[PDB]
Amino acid sequence: AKLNLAVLNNVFSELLTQEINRSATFLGLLSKYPERKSNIQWGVGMGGT
């Protein structure tokens, strides 16, 4: 077609396919807690008696 071969359109389709593995499994169950302090600090007991 010597007419309308230089004036075509180049539309895509609605077919984006996600190809990356972006998942959070172990983060998704750690029972997230807030904290307003410089460092969490607790006590650990040993033996001795």
Added chain:
Amino acid sequence: NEELRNLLEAQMRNAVEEIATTLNKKLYDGSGAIADGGLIGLSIAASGQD
């Protein structure tokens, strides 16, 4: 920590529970033995000993 305030009562409970966990520790092996608590035990109560 509301367990370590009363230092007499907390250490008394560790003292009794250390008597108990060394009592059955030296109950499988008594051997008479003034240093061992005075038990005869079970290492010679279930053998060919006297």
